[PDB]
Design a protein around this nucleic acid. Sequence first.
RNA 1: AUACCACACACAAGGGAUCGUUUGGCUCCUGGGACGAGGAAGGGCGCAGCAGAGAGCGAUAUGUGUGGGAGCAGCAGCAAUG
RNA 2: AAAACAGUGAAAUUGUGUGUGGACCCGAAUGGAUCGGGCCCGUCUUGAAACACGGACCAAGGAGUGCACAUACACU
RNA 3: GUACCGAGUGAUCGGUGGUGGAGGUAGAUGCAGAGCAGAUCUUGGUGGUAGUAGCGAUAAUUUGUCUUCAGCGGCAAAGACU
Lengths: 89, 154, 135, 51, 131
Amino acid sequence: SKGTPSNGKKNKRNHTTCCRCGSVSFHKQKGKCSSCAYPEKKMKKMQNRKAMLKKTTGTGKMRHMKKERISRRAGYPGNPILKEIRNKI
Amino acid sequence: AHKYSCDISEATSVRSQYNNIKIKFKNTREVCNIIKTMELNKAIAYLNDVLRFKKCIPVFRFAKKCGRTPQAKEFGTDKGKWPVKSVAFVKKMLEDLLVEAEKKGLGTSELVIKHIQVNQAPKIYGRKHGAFGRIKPYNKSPSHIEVIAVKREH
Amino acid sequence: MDIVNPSLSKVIDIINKGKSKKQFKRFQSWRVKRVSESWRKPRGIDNRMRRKFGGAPDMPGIGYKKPNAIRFLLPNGYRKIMVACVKDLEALISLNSFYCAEIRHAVGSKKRIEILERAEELGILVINKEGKLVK
Amino acid sequence: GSIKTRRIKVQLVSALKKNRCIPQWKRACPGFKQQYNFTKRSWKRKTLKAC
Amino acid sequence: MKFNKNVTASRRKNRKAHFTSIGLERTKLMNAPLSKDLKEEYGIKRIAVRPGDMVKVVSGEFKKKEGVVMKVNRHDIKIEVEGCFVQKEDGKKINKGIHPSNLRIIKLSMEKDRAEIINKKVEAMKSEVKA
RNA sequence: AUACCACACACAAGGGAUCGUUUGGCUCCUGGGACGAGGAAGGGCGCAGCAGAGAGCGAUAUGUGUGGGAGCAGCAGCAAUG
RNA sequence: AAAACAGUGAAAUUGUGUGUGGACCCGAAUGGAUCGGGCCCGUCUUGAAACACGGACCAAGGAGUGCACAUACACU
RNA sequence: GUACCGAGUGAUCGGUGGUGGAGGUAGAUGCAGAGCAGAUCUUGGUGGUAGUAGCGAUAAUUUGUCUUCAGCGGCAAAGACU
Ligand SMILES: [Zn+2]
């Protein structure tokens, strides 16, 4: 029967951890990730605005982008040992 | 500190109270009800007989569908019971007040149980599984206790 | 306190014994705790009180209003005015024949002393005279 | 079971080090307001999804 | 009246700026007045209180007392003064902290960099006073 | 109605309404509109004397230079040679 | 998803003590037995006490509003 | 917030005594997210039923002895079962 007794046979596992996004959604037989479309070059279309804002720029650390803004503020000064190269250029 | 539920002098009285005890509420108040106004040595003697099945606790408020018994005739009713777990606790509690009485310098006799009250403490939650995939409550109902005994003027 | 307006002294007891003690409780406020005692008019299609069957209670209305002369009169025979300053009593100086003063609850002890001293010299009755200042 | 991949093992190792209560000295610190670590888990009540 | 629109007059903003202060801005919170004599001995009108300096308590329970500063709590803005304490049920004594602005300085601790700190402030005044 | 059931008042329980408060939200205005093969955005794993989560940082995981200047919140140790 | 102050601490509901009654309301009284009148509210309906439906109990929240265009009235 | 007492046909308003520990009104006008018994209403908290219904398909359990401090827990000797 289709209820409790059929639950006993459910011991196989079709999805594993995706290497691009972490989300335990890589379908091994299809060769595709259901969250991010790996191995396609572009990321997947997200279903709605609510769901996509959960993965935008600024939801993580933004390491490089923050440093760039501080350097731009300072006038891109560079390493002080090498000022002469900068000044010539 | 604790505000006991009535006003009696500190001299000529002895007291105890406990909170959140893990004896069952409804059983405990049927015990307390019958030993009110009784003399302390009589109370301790009576409770010893209940533990041995020689006498019983009569029931009046929490009493539906209870068994009938020849031991209940001593209090003019048919219905009675033997709640061992509550009796052992109350007996210990009363015995300690005789220690306090002796140490305080009253007599070990002429002490009468003037006040005693039981209150409900907050529930402790539990669960049991039922049929058709349901879950139902399975909680526990503890209690709080006060006693004051006084010396008879006689 | 046992004081009376001198213009009504020989009449005040007739007046007092004549006042109604009727109450107009809301319908079924006796049946469920969620309905307060405060009057509301019943508006149901079937309702026995609205339809005025014998045995249901009475409803408020204009017929019960007191005569214009007796209305608002305290049991000592005066009407009341609220005060909170020394400069308030100054208003009563023409009206002290029929009106008396009642100091507002929030005025504190140190200030009340100053109000009562002024009331004595102007000859104005204060009905909360004892108040908090008994100690 | 006994057979594991390298990727599965690192997930178990990390899931095992994170599963600890608040150390008893932190509770004495003036600025500290946590009662219990809400990220603690039991194998009887939750799945890791390491698969 | 304020005519500069870059400075805020919001209660919410002023309060956050107070409690979340750090660094040099935190040091400004620990300032106290100098006594009349010291304001002739030195140019300054007020300084940040440090251990070892000598203070008169001018408000509160311990009014009129004098003593040496033992400790400076920066997180909970309070100063502990020698001999201002309460006794517990145990008989054990706990120093009670006083807010900086309820103190007044009577003698300065001149250990370490204090003499240079004072010099730096006096010069900063004159630089603009004489102009 | 000795003891059950109901109501009123005082005391003790049980729950979190009301009043007082707010380093949060929302709206309008003004500025800004600055990413990546020199490896981004996003994911994982490591790093503390006692350290789980979060914050900060990459095996150089509190290094160098400039301007300042008094403590490091608990316990043990550090600090005008900062 | 929930969760503010180690403030204040209502109602439902429980125990103990003291009083008054046997479902309760309105009118009128005694030292004391009681006398007279009253069916359960809300709602659709010719017609509800209904063998019509909704309602175990308490707190808090909970439903004719904003703009545009013609209009009649009152006021400047 | 809670007991009493007074004023009003009524929506409501005022005072007194305890509790509480920092804010609050009276008059004339302005703007509205402006008054609850009900919606098999929404969220949270609590009753009666009730110390009641039930908790015991399967091989089975007894005695002594120590702990446990009051676990048919452990160990010896029997009796059974897959
Ligand atoms: Zn993916």
